[PDB]
């Protein structure tokens, strides 16, 4: 009826396996450069982290069926309940709606966190969809991301202390931490800089978790252990 | 090494058929409501359309391998050259990078087009990826979208003239145009409102095309016929 | 190096979600006609059913990682252990190796079951692959197929008794059983034909299950209830 | 209605890109062992090759929309016309129907080609589906397979001559042909065994092509050059 309509036949199905956890993970694109251009504090910047969380909250409020979100550094993951049928579970739908809504928010609420530092340009975001077949796999995924947060924060805190406090060159710091263990990094922070790693802000150490409590509220607790899951059984126990 | 790492095994491949045209199409999410809340002019609003185009330009500048974009109303399509290997041609990568970069820009440059009308909230965008196997199919796709622009603008121009000038109720206008042909709509515009449809702004009639000429420049020309393609052979004749 | 080799780029990935149950189900193609042309006994034919089972055994013996198979009427399903990496879990590999090996066997061993009735032509088989994310879903799948066996055998036994013993026309039998319940079908079998449905051969009532006990042995037991699974825990409890 | 029916939700879509060539390629599984056990003549065996072709003919006759088939050694490829909608273009359907029908035939017609040599066991077949976006890619695929035929036959003919006529050990033959060029292999065949490679049976040199002329007829002509395609334009020029 448009003799051009036939081009619709080319659209492919990208349905996520039914009754499975659907996760959309976002990553700030070239945020290493973005951070430099906007003078992000090292090793951690409250403005940046909280802005990310604000965006994640917006995504959870504007979209449907997201039961939990976890973010750290330049990433954020959104877990959609496994019984969802939001867009016939079309992978592309999950991806673009989360990526777009997050990006628009990032710019929209920028001023609420960077009152002075001006936004030099509209940033991009890397996104992906992953389907986890069980509760244990989803948990192991979140644990994987939280553990990543811990590993990187421990490394970056010592790293920047060696540079910003000891005056080592980036290259010197690196060689210095080469082959070091978790306990060593902790030892260096305590001896060289009188820093007790365990007293660092929870947000920097554990990242941020968002769950419905109704609005999506921030928590910087451990999600690797069972405690968290035993306290919020509504998330993993939902139907389907 | 995190005993949680196994969760990466769940990531699925979403590679686009090699040596084929890859198109990412975006649609403003619930833009019918967005338009109302931001007092978009009917049947066409220069601010809205130009803002879209500005975002499309940003996407073409920040991403890689896009050789042509076409936009109209609340949509924009981006055509990546078929020999691209940007992200191993992972569909999700095309989608999220285009959707996010577009959305962030939409908010970022909003003021350059809506100097007075304030942005009430960060909008979302619907996205999708389609693979077209040949030059002819890609052309028919673009033609399909431009033809859609024509059909909708002709209808909307009469429709809103009947409401805004003749004072018919939305429902009256609709029944009035029910079963009408292209030639009739044109006749009504000419007799009832002394409007020559063919003299309406090119942008509203044909939409907008972006190609590299180096920066991405706007053109409101016809792309259904051969003229355009004969004049810009670099686009479809590129290797692979 | 063949300047034609590039065509390999077109091959797409079809990997089954990792650590999930992979099932290949086969259906005799146009076996309604095949059955007629080979004078299959109604409602059940021992030769046909046992031949199917023999083929299923061959598939389990020649391929790798199949832990259980279930067959009935003209179908057979093969369950590959979830930790398998046989062909990098490529769906096409599971499909074609099962479908081909089964078909070749169907013809090869035909004489061992149809000593007199000659094979009129080499038949085809319909195949598919399905991924079940959990032990419960796999069980429900097998239950679904066994329950189907029960529903169809109960219906077919009465149906053919009404035709073959009472002399009703296929159409008369159908209208007669229209809207009948399980208990009714059982009542008719008992009153009209002095048939105790529960005494029919186990194979016709429950179908056939193949598991390793080493060779794949036939069992016509119930697999919907827990008994079976409690007795053969090795199947569902295997690693990954 | 079976409270088990929900398991159907797990079935995934595997539709082949519309208006594209769909190819199903089969490979005899472990046919190196099969060949030995059935005393296949080296370097070529007419019985084996013709049996394969017979099977391919059966596949083309029993299935729908196959416009061309090409086989050599232990493989056979089936090209389905690009406008086909046979099974909604479900990849699995193409695969299993071709693989099963081929395998059953292989056993069924075995005696018509191996009147004496008995079939020791029902063989299996490896299968796969590939979608080629254009006429040139499909041609390059067929060329790729025919060229493979040439390369292997030239190599195997010298190779087995060196063993069967010169008495070299398999390992000696190999080292002897190591680093040799096409012209060299030809030279050795002519000087050492008074063999004119170009006079070898066409079937062994070019393989076999099947096209509709109505029944599917065998041809051992070149399909790399344009001659073949100019003479049978009906194949590549068909609609869609």
Among C104, B91, C20, B133, which residue's Cα sits nearest to residue D127?
Answer: C104
Which residues sit opposite A127 in a β-bridge?
A: A26
Q: Which two tokens stand for residue C195?
A: 């048939």
User: Looking at CA atoms only, how far is residue C133 from chain A in angstroms?
Assistant: 5
- Contacting subunits of C (3+ beta carbon pairs below 8 A): A, B, D
Helix (H) or strand (E) holding D183, with range, is: helix D182-193
What is the chain C residue with the closest CA to A19?
C133
Strand order in the sheet with C208-212: C125-132, C21-28, C75-80, C66-72, C208-212, C216-219
> DSSP string of D2-28?
-S-GGGGGGPPP-B--TTSEEEEEEEE
DSSP-assigned letter for residue A29:
T
Which of C4, C5, C8, C9 is the mutation pick for testing B, counting most B CBs within 10 A?
Answer: C9
CA distance C238 to A226: 25
- How far is B107 from A107, CA to CA, in rounded Å? 6
Measure CA of the first residue to CA of the last residue in chain C; give whole Å: 41
> Are the C-beta atoms of residues C84 and C65 closer than 8 Å to each other?
yes
- The secondary structure element, H or E, covering residue C20 is none
Nearest residue in B to A148, CA atom: B2
Was D89 annotated as part of a binding site?
no
Chain A: closest CA distance from residue C21 (Å): 10
CA-nearest residue to B130 within chain D is D17
How near does any CA of chain C get to the CA of B199, in Å?
A: 47
Rounded to whole angstroms, how far apart are CA atoms D4 and C145? Answer: 9
> Side-chain half-sphere of C31: how many Cα atoms within 13 Å?
17
Residue of B4, B5, B7, B12 to mutate when probing chain C, most C C-beta within 10 A: B12
What residues in B contact C17, CB-CB < 8 Å?
A: 10, 12
Q: What are phi and psi of C218, to 5 degrees?
A: -80, 140
Question: Could you give the CA distance from residue C164 to residue C172 in angstroms, rounded to a whole number?
Answer: 12
> Which chains share 3+ C-beta pairs under 8 angstroms with A?
B, C, D
Closest CA–CA distance from residue B78 to any residue of chain D (Å): 20
Q: Do D96 and C99 touch (CB under 8 A)?
A: yes
Q: Which residues contact D112 (CB under 8 A, 6 or more apart)?
A: D51, D54
Q: Which residues of B touch D20 (CB under 8 A)?
A: 133
Tokens of C24: 């290949």
- B18 to chain D: nearest residue by CA? D133
Report the alpha-carbon distance of residue C6 to residue D184 in Å, rounded: 27
Q: What is the dihedral of CA C44, C46, C47, C52, to 10 degrees?
A: 90
Contacts of C104 in chain D (CB under 8 A): 103-104, 106-107, 122-125
Among D141, D46, D63, smallest CA distance to D102 is for D63
Nearest-by-Cβ selection for B122 from A63, A99, A105: A105
What CA–CA distance (Å, rounded) separates B74 from D178?
64
Distance CA A137, CA A135 (A): 6
CB-CB contact of C139 with C225 (8 Å):
no
| Sequence-ordered alpha helix ranges (H) in chain C | 31-37, 46-62, 91-108, 135-164, 170-177, 182-193, 202-206, 226-231, 234-237
To the question of whether residue D30 is assigned a binding role by annotation, the answer is: yes
Q: Of the candidates B79, B86, B95, which has an alpha carbon nearest to the alpha carbon of residue B140?
A: B79
Look-up of token digits 């990954």: C240
- Residues 6+ away with beta carbon under 8 Å from C192: C161, C162, C165, C166
> Quick one: how many helices (H) and strands (E) in chain D?
9, 6
D73 annotated binding-site participant: yes
- Please give, rounded to a whole number of angstroms, the shortest distance from the CA of A166 to a CA of chain B: 31
H or E stretch at C66: strand C66-72
| CA dist., res. D147 & res. D206, Å (int) | 8
* Interatomic CA distance for residues B25 and B125, integer angstroms: 10
- Domains of chain A, by residue range, sit at 1-240
The residues facing D129 across adjacent strands are D24
Method: X-ray
**In which element (H, E) is residue B201 found?**
none
CB pair distance less than 8 Å for D19 and A9: yes
**CB-based contact C12:C117 (threshold 8 Å):** no
Distance CA B71, CA B24 (A): 12
Q: For the residues of A50-79, what is the DSSP string, one character each?
A: HHHHHHHHHHHHHSS-EEEEEEETTEEEEE
CATH 3.30.70.3000 fits B1-240, yes or no: yes
CA distance A13 to chain C (A): 14
Cβ–Cβ of B17/C12 closer than 8 Å? yes
Q: Which residues of D touch A17 (CB under 8 A)?
A: 10, 12
What is the spatial distance between Cα D73 and Cα D64, in angstroms, rounded to a whole number? 25
- Residue D211 phi/psi, 5-degree rounding, is -140, 160
Question: Rounded to the nearest 5 degrees, what angle is found at the Cα of D138, between the Cα atoms of D134 and D139?
Answer: 115
Q: Which residues does B102 contact at the CB level (< 8 Å), separation at least 6? A: A100, A103, B26, B55, B56, B58, B59, B76, B125
For D96, the closest of C7, C119, C127 (CB atoms) is: C127
Cβ contact, residue pair A144, B99, below 8 Å: no
Using a CB-CB cut-off of 8 Å, the residues of chain D touching B19 are: 133, 137
Breaks (C-N over 2.5 A) in chain B follow: 213
Residue of C5, C6, C18 best to disrupt the B interface, most CBs of B under 10 A: C18
Helices within C178-224 (DSSP H only): 182-193, 202-206
CB–CB contact D9 A18 (8 Å): yes
């Amino acid at each position: 009826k448009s003799k051009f309509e036939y081009v619709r036949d080319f659209e492919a199905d990208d349905t996520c396996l039914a009754h499975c956890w659907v996760v959309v993970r976002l990553d700030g694109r070239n945020f290493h450069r973005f951070a430099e251009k906007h003078n992000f504090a090292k090793p951690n910047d409250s403005r940046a982290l909280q802005l990310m969380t604000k965006c994640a909250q917006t995504v959870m409020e504007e979209l449907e069926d997201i039961v939990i979100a976890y973010g750290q550094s330049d990433e954020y993951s959104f877990v959609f309940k496994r019984k969802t049928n939001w867009f016939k579970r079309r992978a592309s739908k999950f991806m673009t709606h989360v990526a777009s809504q997050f990006a628009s928010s990032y710019v929209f609420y920028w001023r609420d966190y960077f009152e002075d530092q001006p936004l030099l340009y509209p940033p991009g975001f890397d996104g992906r969809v992953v389907v986890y077949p069980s509760n244990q796999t989803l948990k192991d995924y979140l644990s994987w991301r939280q553990a990543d947060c811990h590993i990187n924060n421990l490394y970056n805190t010592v790293f920047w202390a060696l540079i910003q406090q000891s005056g080592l060159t980036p290259v010197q710091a690196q060689g210095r931490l080469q082959g070091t263990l978790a306990a060593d990094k902790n030892e260096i922070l305590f001896s060289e800089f009188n820093i007790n790693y365990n007293n660092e802000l929870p947000m920097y150490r554990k990242g941020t978790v968002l769950i419905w409590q109704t609005k999506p509220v921030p928590l910087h607790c451990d999600i690797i252990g069972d405690a968290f899951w035993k306290e919020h059984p509504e998330i993993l126990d939902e139907d389907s």
